[PDB]
Design a protein around this nucleic acid. Structure first.
Lengths: 54, 83, 83, 47, 205, 215, 129, 150
RNA sequence: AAAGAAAAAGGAAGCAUUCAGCAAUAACAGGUCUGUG
RNA sequence: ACGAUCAGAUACCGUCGUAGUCCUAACUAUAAACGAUGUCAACCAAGGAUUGGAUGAAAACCUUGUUCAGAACUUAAAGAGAAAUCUUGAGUUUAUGGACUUCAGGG
RNA sequence: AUUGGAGGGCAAGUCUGGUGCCAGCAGCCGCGGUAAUUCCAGCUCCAAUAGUGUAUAUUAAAGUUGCUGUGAUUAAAACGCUCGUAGUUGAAUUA
RNA sequence: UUAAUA
């Protein structure tokens, strides 16, 4: 079962090292956009109420 | 001679009532002061909430009146409730 | 209510929602109005929650029908609230 | 004592309800206290 | 004063919060969080006042940084929902405050003979609805609590509440990240005029 | 020895010198060795040893339930309950529970401030089950006008003069003492006129000694 | 129906303080209700109150500060003699230094301490700890 | 609540906090008195008389304009009915039920409510006699109320 | 998804392989003072 | 009154069947006539839904906001109780007193 | 220096001789059927003491008669319901 | 279907 997939009660050194290499992986280009934004018209009510336009 | 009182008890900052020795839900929140750069100071303002206040689900609002009064919050509690 | 508001100074929105008597100082929800009869130029002053058929002061042109709580003015009758 | 808050009925600001007859034993039971079930079946069995 | 001019949020944080749909609450509104809600949405969804969310967030961060200066281990942060396990663990990494990711054992705060007997001075909970067990134990050990509450949540045994969305991963990851960044800023370890190296995507699940 | 809780660590170092310091901030006591350290020479009084029984397939499972009361004669008292298969283990377990249930007893004067403090400050009522015990302040000469069961407890709390008016099934010795402990327990929770003043800002021992405890 | 408006007012105030409320509203205002509140204020059990006129025996708003344990009225106002003050005080007040009765006398509505000084008895109204 | 049945309704009228006449009202007391006395001659109850002025003439309260109540004005003008308005309307209802009861002898809810209605009459008559409005020689008789209340 | 279940093959052995030994808490006022210095 | 069942069965089961069941007039005046909870009044923690009005929005009925009245329900770490349970009270009671009537005193 | 008692209520004996569900003790629970802490006796000591037991009655205990002060869903106990006279209780308001 | 007692 371990070879097929992880097991809840089993945790070995190899499994922990694989987790640390993959969870800390950070994309070079973040998936949060900057030059698109854009939302529905009623979203713009709070941005302008707060005090900043897009 | 000997002191009359074993101790002088604390007063809840919301209800202005004594905190019993057995009140095991009474919290104490310390809010440190900050300098002009936003870095906190060793000193702090102490706050006390009685056990019954917390269990009713009203301690959060009751504190917000006290936090706003002392300046830690500015635009949280509206005017008609700022009492 | 667990959250409590100021009782001396109630907001306009809260006072408008309350029942006409349960306000701080009870006020009526009614008012006195005048209607411009379509047939002529005359104006008839009347109650808001009138309990009878209302005709023009000049001629017998009807202007409202009483329906259990407020006058039902005709679609071509224009009115202004007397202050 | 009171095994049920509603006394086992469906009764409220009434206080007398008509009787209905049991489907099996023919007993008289009040309309609200009776155990009502609905049946919708074909007149031909699946065989 | 007690809320100096430097603690107001920049436009980017308000830009980021809307990008992560933090402001959007649930349908049913609890009586305790009526103040935070600004106006019901088009589809009867509560929309939180983002200014009040930040004011509560900075106040919560100030309280945490006060305790965590001397003994960071006296702050315990629990995250019942799997969409907050990574965020709580990342908070543990950069602050040193003990974190609980899995199921909360009912008695870890009161059973002194138990080997995982943890004695905190402050508890942070990601959801009062999910983490009721940690919340209810604070009523036995005299410990204040901080919570990230949605509009439907019950505000019992909580003393500082952060009104925010706490279901979507973007909403959950951002608030933990913003809380950690503000905690360090009050601690002085992070200049208020510079950008944090770790981005939000590290906190997201 | 070998304390496990933070307060237990503090008292063993001799940092919390007064039991009243713990009561001020409402810190729970979880080690009976703490009370022994802070209140030496406590007096013991076992109120009763009632035997309960559980019906089983083979018969009855008899256990002995011990009600013991503890407390020095200077305003502290505690009541603990424990049931065990042996008298020796029942008393020892109840004795431990009595120390954990220590409570402060506020007492005052009757008519004037002539030392020393002798009687309860006001009228206090303890609400057990059907048993209800009322305590009334009394002049100097009168002893504890009460049944022997709560008189033994009221002596250990240092209350030299009091008046009592009991109501309910006082033959229930378990509830009779439990109601007395309830009346005394709320003596310091009742806000009289003399407690209106907030006093001065004090520091909790758990906050100002947190650096040493963690390290 | 409403027989004792002072009973309705004093039960409102105690219920407000048990829940820890900051202020309470009393719908029918009377002279006796105002004089009872003034006695409590002189001993600093309430902060203040404001009488709002509604042309219909208007309302009273009382501000409470964590101090009034219990204020109550007493059913039929017994004629209290100066020799009966101790018998009433021993029954209604928790101790000899804390509580205070309230009596209506020819010299106004006073408490037991200043009615004793003026050497006058009267019908008892209530008390407060 | 209501005197006889367990109903509890709070349907009331709310007098405004202005004891004087409104600014927009310019009619004098002479016009009010003459119009209100003209309605009194038409056989109209004071409760209805005030309503007609409020709906038609915009005089919603008469104590605000003339300084005295409707009944006092009619007493001064001699138009106050001998039998007070609330007692007359109660005797009219008792007669109406009693007439229906003649043909329908088996109606037991009408006999119950006739008992309640007539108890109201004896409660009001007791009060008015003590208030000297009704002479002590007045007495309600079912064999007599048919003619006086018609 | 898991603890597991049912063929079949292989095997000397595949019902926990089969048959037994030891076998907890509490109890009977079950038999023996005619086994006992 | 029959026929079963049973040791017997004057009963449960089956068949027949007088009074009664139904309407009118008149008596009777009792029920686990129960919410086993007297009538009136004040204060009183969170909700969702419903019956009937009023009042805005949304084109008689439906969907929503507010408010009055009605029969109910859910949650409580709170109040009470011997507990079950009660919360539109069975709460606000040894911190004992809002008004009135009826009833109980071991079996 | 006597009187009453030594299982519990209730201070005082798991001492020795007889007695064997018999005699009997026992205000109440109960003890006695052959190994009686309770019967009948011997010794010892428990209480009061020139007094000490018993019986009947008053008072407290009794918040088991309630004005202070009771209880009424299930322990006993809210009239089937409404009207109704006496009785009791009755909104604010006057320098 | 029938099924009493100590």
């Amino acid at each position: 079962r371990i070879q097929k997939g992880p097991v809840r009660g089993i945790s070995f050194k190899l499994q922990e090292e694989e987790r640390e290499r993959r969870d800390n992986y950070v994309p070079e280009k973040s998936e949060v956009n900057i030059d698109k934004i854009t939302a529905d018209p009623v979203t713009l009510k709070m941005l302008e109420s707060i005090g900043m336009p897009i | 001679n000997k002191k009359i009182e074993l101790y002088i008890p604390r007063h809840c900052s919301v209800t202005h009532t004594l905190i019993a020795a057995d009140d095991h839900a009474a919290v104490q929140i310390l809010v440190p002061h900050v300098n002009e750069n936003g870095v906190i100071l060793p000193e702090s303002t102490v706050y006390t909430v009685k056990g019954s206040v917390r269990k009713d689900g009203i301690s959060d609002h009751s504190l917000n009146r006290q936090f706003q009064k002392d300046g830690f919050l500015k635009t949280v509690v509206p005017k008609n409730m700022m009492i | 209510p667990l959250i409590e508001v100021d009782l001396l100074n109630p907001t306009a929105a809260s006072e408008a929602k309350a029942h006409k008597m349960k306000r701080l100082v009870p006020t009526p929800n009614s008012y006195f109005l005048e209607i411009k009869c379509p047939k002529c130029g005359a104006t008839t002053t009347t109650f808001s929650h009138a309990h009878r058929q209302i005709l023009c002061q000049k001629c017998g042109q009807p202007l409202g029908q009483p329906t259990g709580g407020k006058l039902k003015l005709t679609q071509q009758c224009k009115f202004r609230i007397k202050k | 004592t009171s095994k049920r808050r509603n006394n086992g009925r469906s009764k409220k600001g009434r206080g007398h309800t008509q009787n209905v007859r049991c489907s099996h034993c023919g007993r008289c039971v009040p309309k609200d206290k009776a155990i009502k079930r609905y049946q919708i079946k074909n007149i031909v069995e699946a065989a | 004063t007690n809320f100096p001019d430097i603690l107001k949020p920049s436009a980017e944080d308000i830009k980021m919060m809307v990008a992560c749909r933090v402001h959007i609450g649930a349908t049913n509104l609890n009586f305790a969080m009526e103040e935070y809600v600004y106006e019901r949405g088009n589809n009867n969804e509560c929309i939180f006042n983002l200014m009040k969310t930040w004011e509560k967030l900075s106040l919560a961060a100030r309280v945490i940084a006060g305790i965590s200066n001397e003994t960071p281990s006296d702050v315990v942060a629990v995250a019942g929902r799997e969409m907050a396990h990574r965020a709580s663990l990342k908070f543990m990494k950069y602050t040193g405050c003990t974190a609980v990711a899995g199921r909360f054992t009912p008695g870890s705060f009161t059973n002194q003979i138990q080997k995982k007997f943890m004695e905190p001075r402050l508890i942070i909970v990601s959801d009062p609805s999910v983490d009721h067990q940690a919340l209810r134990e604070s009523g036995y050990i005299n410990v204040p609590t901080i919570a990230f509450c949605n509009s439907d949540n019950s505000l019992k045994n909580v003393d500082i509440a952060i009104p925010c969305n706490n279901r979507s991963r973007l909403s959950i990851g951002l608030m933990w990240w913003m809380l950690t960044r503000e905690i360090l800023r009050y601690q002085g370890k992070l200049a208020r005029d510079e950008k944090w190296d770790v981005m939000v995507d590290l906190f997201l699940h | 020895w070998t304390p496990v809780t933070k307060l237990g660590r503090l008292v063993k170092d001799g940092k919390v010198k007064s039991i009243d310091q713990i009561f001020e901030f409402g810190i729970k006591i979880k080690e009976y060795q703490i009370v022994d350290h802070l209140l030496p020479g406590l007096k013991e009084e076992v109120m009763t040893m009632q035997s309960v029984q559980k019906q089983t397939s083979a018969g009855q499972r008899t256990r002995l339930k011990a009600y013991v009361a503890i407390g020095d004669h200077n305003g502290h008292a505690g009541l603990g309950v424990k049931c065990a298969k042996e008298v020796a283990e029942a008393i020892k377990g109840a004795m431990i529970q009595a120390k954990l249930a220590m409570v402060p007893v506020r007492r005052g004067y009757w008519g004037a401030t002539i030392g020393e403090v002798h009687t309860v400050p006001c009228k206090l009522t303890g609400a057990c089950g059907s048993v209800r015990v009322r305590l009334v302040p009394a002049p100097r000469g009168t002893g504890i006008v009460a049944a022997p069961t709560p008189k033994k407890f009221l002596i250990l709390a240092g209350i030299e003069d009091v008046f009592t008016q009991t109501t309910g099934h006082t033959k229930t010795l378990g509830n009779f003492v439990k109601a007395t402990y309830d009346a005394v327990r709320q003596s310091y929770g009742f806000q009289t006129k003399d407690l209106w003043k907030v006093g001065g800002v004090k520091q909790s021992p758990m906050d100002k000694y947190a650096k040493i405890l963690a390290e | 129906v409403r027989v004792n408006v002072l009973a309705d007012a004093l039960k409102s105030i105690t219920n407000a303080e048990k829940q820890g409320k900051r202020q309470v509203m009393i719908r029918p205002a009377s002279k006796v209700i105002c004089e009872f509140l003034n006695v409590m204020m002189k001993h600093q059990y309430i902060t203040d109150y404001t009488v709002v006129d509604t042309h219909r025996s208007g309302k009273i708003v009382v501000n409470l500060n964590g101090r009034l344990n219990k204020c109550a009225v007493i059913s039929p106002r017994f004629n209290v003699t100066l020799s009966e003050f101790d018998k009433w005080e021993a029954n209604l007040l928790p101790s000899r230094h804390f509580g205070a009765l309230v009596l209506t006398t020819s010299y106004g509505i006073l408490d037991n301490t200043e009615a004793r000084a003026k050497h006058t008895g009267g019908r008892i109204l209530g008390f407060f700890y | 609540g209501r005197m006889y049945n367990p109903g509890r309704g709070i349907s009331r009228r709310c007098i405004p906090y202005r004891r004087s006449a409104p600014s927009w009202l310019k009619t004098s007391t002479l016009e009010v008195i003459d119009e209100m006395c003209k309605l009194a001659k038409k056989g109209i109850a004071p409760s209805q008389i005030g309503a007609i002025m409020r709906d038609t003439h915009g005089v919603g309260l008469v104590k605000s304009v003339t300084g005295s109540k409707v009944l006092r004005i009619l007493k001064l003008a001699g138009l106050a009915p001998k039998i007070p308005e609330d007692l007359y309307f109660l005797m009219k209802r008792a007669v109406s039920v009693r007439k229906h009861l003649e043909k329908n002898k088996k109606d037991k809810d009408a006999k119950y409510h006739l008992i309640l209605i007539e108890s109201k009459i004896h409660r009001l008559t007791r009060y008015y006699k003590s208030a000297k409005v009704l002479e002590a020689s007045f007495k309600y008789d079912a064999n007599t109320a048919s003619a006086i209340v018609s």
